[PDB]
């Protein structure tokens with residue numbers, strides 16, 4: 001039933017993530033975006049329950065996408081996934097009411113749990129970044 | 132089922148919280164402490180699945196009890212419940228790996244849901260304090 005959008009600029013990771021998401025029993029479909037611009041374009045057109053957003057992407061970052069979602073009052077759940085432990089990225093995401101913030105140090109099983117958590121109206125913040 | 136400890140120095144609130152908790156079908160027992168020192172004495176004697184801790188109490192604050200629990204590595208989830216939005220309190224709790232941090236502006240139903248969240252191995256922080 002889950003309609004998922006994955007915005008990630010590294011083709012190999014995006015592809016791998018999306019393939020594994022598609023094999024999940026509760027996942028209906030997975031939209032792909034290579035940057036923040038394609039991400040917003042898809043959110044302007046398609047039904048999306050949850051967006052998994054990389055931070056550092058060309059054209060528009062995942063944080064910009066999150067802010068757009070908030071400014072437009074979309075109810076999309078947003079999970080930021082990033083390699084970066086930069087405090088400013090986290091602070092900016094929290095100010096923008098992100099639902100979850102996950103480092104790419106986490107596993108795919110970890111990510112899956114996170115998705116379930118936010119679908120249930122809960123939040124999850126990288127322990128490393130709460131710090 | 133769940134063995135709960137409530138440390139809260141306001142008698143009426145502590146009494147009321149504990150009665151409602153005891154009425155929960157999945158609650159086995161509720162221990163009461165009126166200050167931080169009593170809470171530690173009880174934790175040195177009985178097993179507790181979740182400790183619900185007020186911050187400002189006599190002798191030792193709930194933040195000190197939380198740090199004590201963590202230093203003893205007890206298998207005890209800790210939910211801090213407080214009137215106060217002080218950033219220092221919240222920062223101290225997070226550094227000690229608090230499981231949930233809940234303002235007394237929340238409802239008993241909110242608190243109940245929080246108890247299940249931490250037992251499910253997840254965390255919950257007051258939106259106000261995340262800022």
Ligand code: BEF
Pocket residue numbers: 054055056057081082083084104
């Ligand atoms: F490039 Be992402 F932020 F990992």
Ligand code: BEF
Pocket residue numbers: 185186187188212213214215235
């Ligand atoms: F006194 Be408690 F911290 F509400």
Ligand SMILES: [Mg+2]
Pocket residue numbers: 008009010054055056057
């Ligand atoms: Mg990137």
Ligand SMILES: [Mg+2]
Pocket residue numbers: 139140141185186187188
């Ligand atoms: Mg008090």
